[PDB]
Symmetry: C5
């Protein structure tokens, strides 16, 4: 499984952009990422910006717009895509993931992937720390801090 | 709660499967006007032959005029060949690229369905929800956040 | 379409694998542009390349040499015993989208990605099918005009 | 008949599955020389460990010297993992990119097969047709059309 | 018989599945030093949380220092969601991009497997061949050919 770090980033500025489809799963993820950065990495509450966009499709664009306006040491993109009856899931999952990798590489700002691509709601909730699962948001918080520091 | 009386929105839609396209365009327009105070004269509506032309039509139009947000609308239905799989992927990638290259929010109004029924259901027919409404709200929201 | 493009310059690049299917497609695109959209025969350049893989590159080279208002890329890819079909279908389609977006010139997709010969011939107007080359011709004129005017 | 006595051709090939690679390189070279009058000293041949390095080895080489066309040759065989699926796609994409970025025609000589037999058959063994010959002609034609 | 006593090599590896990663890194390093005369001081070893961070970690590092070649090592195992499919593809595409953008050879040391056993087997355990050895030799070769 994952192997996080014990790094401190009191001076890091971190941006979190999350979609709003499936808020039930999004909230615990955001909260986990924030709590872990503060309590475990000494990031300051004032240095964490939180923005939202309607859906996962908008994540790469929202992130790109925000890092052009302000300066961040790392960004976490959070969203939940659930397979439905159409091929929508397959095609936008791929476009969004590609989009996030591009924004990070174009800008030089680490973009941490907080995108869940699941078959059903249960899988999402389970990865958000509910029903006995592990909250992946925590890992994302630690990844952001680590990448923020290594980025300089 | 978001109002954009000064927003300029572009809507580019393909012409294959007009039966499903029209309700989507209409739903988007009605929602922006009636619920976000966008002005009818501030909404440009253009069309292209098919979904393949969507990225290019949008790229050309945003180079000519200035818009706060764009909605690309089309309907791709799986057929007997592999056409559907390969162009769906290319068109979706194309739309993301035009949005990122230009800095202009591009809202995805592309239905990629197995059959006609699925598209109509997502256009508000037969008891379904009209996704066009969601796209209009998204365009307004992204347009405002874009500044 | 009631659109006329007597001043449009159109480029058609087609591959040579499966000429049986390629010819009717090219022919249908040309005849439609001329007879239905008043494009002038002398304003239509026709070029060929060995295979679909070369399509994006041939188009990129040609639109850097001359000026065109719209381009139509024509090729036929048929599923074989290897994964060749799946991988290059995807790369070629992506390449044609890229060339159109990089250059600003409308690229009409005239690429058939079929499971067998019959599907391609049918889409070329044979055996009771509709010739897709006609639609491509009309799309190139429309996009050419909207490219500018 | 296309003749290119003044063309400079580059051939970069991987080294995994040499049994299939050699005949492909050989067919491409023999065909350019014997049928298109390309000069032996005008053909550079380079190798890289595997297919993954093909795009990078080609990019490096066309930055150093000037070539009219390039042929990238390699063989990918489906194995037990998903490696085949993911690098086949990335390599093919990488080869298309290098060609478009540079303006130098890149001919695809990458076989993506399910097993060894399929690759040998396409290299001209066991009653099959050597695809290397086709690639040689394609490079000459694209080399001349590139100017 | 390639020797690169003056080569500077960078190795960036993720930390998911350390059980498989360590043997891979070790095989790569040992092979470069014992078989290609690369100096232990000239090998930088960095890590990142997961495979998703590999392309970015590598890009940041080759912007700071100068390396003749890079090896990106990570292990992606198929799970219950579609995560594996989507990020395997994006990471592989990402690594090819960083290598083509920068001009620095990037050796793919990414295992995309269906289960833990497949990964350990490819790391030289349970009778398998250590793929890290192959990657170390590829890096030396591409580093030397890169000039
Ligand atoms: C049919 C359909 C299904 C969608 N499913 C999701 C989903 O599961 N998760 C998500 O974040 N956004 C989803 N979206 C929203 C998408 O990311 C975006 O807001 C819209 O396509 C318009 O840009 C969906 C949109 C559509 C039209
Ligand atoms: C065989 C075939 C099937 C097509 N199916 C669709 C479709 O379902 N929806 C759509 O908007 N366009 C479709 N198109 C049109 C495509 O987006 C484009 O206009 C044309 O390929 C010419 O560039 C299709 C074109 C072809 C050749
Ligand atoms: C195994 C194999 C199958 C091919 N199938 C097609 C096909 O169906 N259509 C086409 O235009 N070209 C095809 N090509 C040619 C390809 O588009 C191209 O010319 C060359 O592969 C690299 O120049 C094929 C090439 C190979 C090696
Ligand atoms: C598990 C595995 C399977 C591979 N299979 C192939 C293959 O079928 N063909 C090929 O040219 N290279 C293959 N390679 C090598 C690849 O092209 C490249 O040299 C290395 O991955 C390091 O970049 C493979 C490498 C690995 C680790
Ligand atoms: C559901 C899930 C599965 C993951 N699986 C892997 C894996 O198999 N290998 C790996 O290196 N990283 C894995 N990661 C981590 C990923 O590469 C990355 O570090 C994090 O998503 C933060 O951007 C996974 C992350 C998630 C959320």
């Amino acid at each position: 499984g994952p192997n996080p770090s014990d790094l401190k980033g009191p001076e890091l500025r971190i941006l979190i952009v999350h979609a709003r489809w499936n808020l039930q799963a999004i909230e615990p993820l955001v909260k986990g990422a924030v709590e872990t950065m503060i309590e475990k990495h000494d990031v300051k509450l004032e240095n964490i910006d939180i923005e939202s966009v309607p859906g996962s499709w908008e994540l790469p664009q929202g992130i790109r717009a925000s890092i052009a306006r302000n300066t961040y040491d790392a960004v976490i993109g959070i969203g939940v895509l659930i397979k439905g009856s159409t091929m929508h899931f397959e095609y936008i999952s791929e476009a969004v993931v590609h989009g996030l990798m591009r924004v990070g590489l174009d800008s030089g700002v680490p973009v941490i992937l907080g995108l869940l691509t699941v078959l059903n709601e249960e899988q999402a909730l389970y990865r958000a720390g509910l029903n006995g699962g592990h909250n992946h948001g925590n890992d994302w918080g630690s990844a952001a801090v680590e990448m923020g520091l290594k980025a300089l």
